[PDB]
Design an enzyme around this catalytic site. Structure first.
Site, PDB file in Angstrom:
ATOM      1  CG  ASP A 145      59.723  33.359  44.861  1.00 47.13           C
ATOM      2  OD1 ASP A 145      60.619  32.449  44.781  1.00 47.13           O
ATOM      3  OD2 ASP A 145      59.430  34.085  43.897  1.00 47.13           O
TER       4      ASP A 145
ATOM      5  CB  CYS B 224      50.373  38.565  38.112  1.00 52.27           C
ATOM      6  SG  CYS B 224      48.590  38.264  38.430  1.00 52.27           S
TER       7      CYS B 224
ATOM      8  NE  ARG C  63      52.696  38.112  42.773  1.00 48.95           N
ATOM      9  CZ  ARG C  63      53.862  37.531  42.508  1.00 48.95           C
ATOM     10  NH1 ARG C  63      54.674  38.041  41.611  1.00 48.95           N
ATOM     11  NH2 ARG C  63      54.219  36.414  43.161  1.00 48.95           N
ATOM     12  CB  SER C  64      46.488  41.437  37.685  1.00 49.10           C
ATOM     13  OG  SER C  64      47.647  40.973  36.999  1.00 49.10           O
TER      14      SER C  64
ATOM     15  CD  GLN D  83      45.654  34.307  42.706  1.00 43.21           C
ATOM     16  OE1 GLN D  83      46.705  34.933  42.757  1.00 43.21           O
ATOM     17  NE2 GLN D  83      45.522  33.209  41.976  1.00 43.21           N
TER      18      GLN D  83
END
Length: 284
Positions: free
Chosen positions: A181, A215, A221-222, A262
């Protein structure tokens, strides 16, 4: 510079934030005018994440051709990917319309439906064989065929039917279920294991359309997934694998979609994943 040495250098000096900010400063800026049109406000999950006009995917309908998705075309590596946001309630039919029109074989999902107590994307595939889904706005039927649940990921076989022509296709859903998370994984071992399963399926290969990867926003994440794949493929292809510069590859990918990678922790993790995955690419 061997990335592995560049890695210890940044790690000992604790400069990950300064490296990451250089990237943000040098990254491309191109117009996204279609994304910001008022008729599309409910097609965008986040106001600050939009596809560039020059690289966006267009739906094949005269109505409204907009979806929050981009084609990342990597010319030296000879790989293409579609990166997109997690589908919204109003865009689940557009998502499967894109998968059909672009001839993809696989969908890659890097998030859970609920994280941190809030919904990160719609429940866009069926969960039981005998309860299929129908998308009336785009005239498609989706059925769960089989499901293989493992410790770190789940693989699903899905059937997509174009109800207008009654053609059917097999789509593979690759769902990584254990990204935390907060933060990034401590070891890239299970993420690399997942990437190789996607590769082995044929979904990343030139006989099919581009894989669709997402994502929540389709950039973090992607971005880690496609940056690591492309970088390992270039170390395979080139005479000098040490010449592969991860920061230069990331800047090339950001000509096609804003914001890829990110945080500085995601940058560090991408280095770690490439370094460790190379210890198979070079023959082990």
């Amino acid at each position: 510079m061997e990335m592995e040495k560049e890695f210890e250098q940044i790690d000992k000096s604790g400069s990950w934030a300064a490296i990451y900010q250089d990237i943000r400063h040098e990254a491309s800026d191109f117009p996204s005018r279609v994304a910001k049109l008022p008729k599309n406000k409910n097609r965008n999950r986040y106001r600050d994440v939009s596809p560039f006009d020059h690289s966006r995917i267009k739906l094949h309908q005269e109505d409204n051709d907009y979806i929050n998705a981009s084609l990342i075309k990597m010319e030296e590596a000879q790989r293409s990917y579609i990166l997109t946001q997690g589908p919204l309630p109003n865009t689940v039919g557009h998502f499967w319309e894109m998968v059909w029109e672009q001839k993809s074989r696989g969908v890659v999902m890097l998030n859970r439906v609920m994280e941190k107590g809030s919904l990160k994307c719609a429940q866009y595939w069926p969960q039981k064989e005998e309860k299929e889904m129908i998308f009336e706005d785009t005239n498609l039927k989706l059925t769960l065929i089989s499901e293989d649940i493992k410790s770190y990921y789940t693989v699903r076989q899905l059937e997509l039917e174009n109800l207008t022509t009654q053609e059917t296709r097999e789509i593979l859903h690759f769902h990584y279920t254990t990204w935390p998370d907060f933060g990034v994984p401590e070891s890239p071992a299970s993420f690399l294991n997942f990437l190789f399963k996607v590769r082995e399926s044929g979904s990343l290969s030139p006989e099919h359309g581009p894989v669709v990867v997402h994502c929540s926003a389709g950039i973090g994440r992607s971005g880690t997934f496609c940056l690591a794949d492309t970088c390992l493929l270039l170390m395979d292809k080139r005479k000098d694998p040490s010449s592969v510069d991860i920061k230069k590859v990331l800047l090339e990918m950001r000509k096609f979609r804003m914001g890829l990678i990110q945080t500085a922790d995601q940058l560090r993790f991408s280095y770690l994943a490439v370094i460790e995955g190379a210890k198979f690419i070079m023959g082990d």
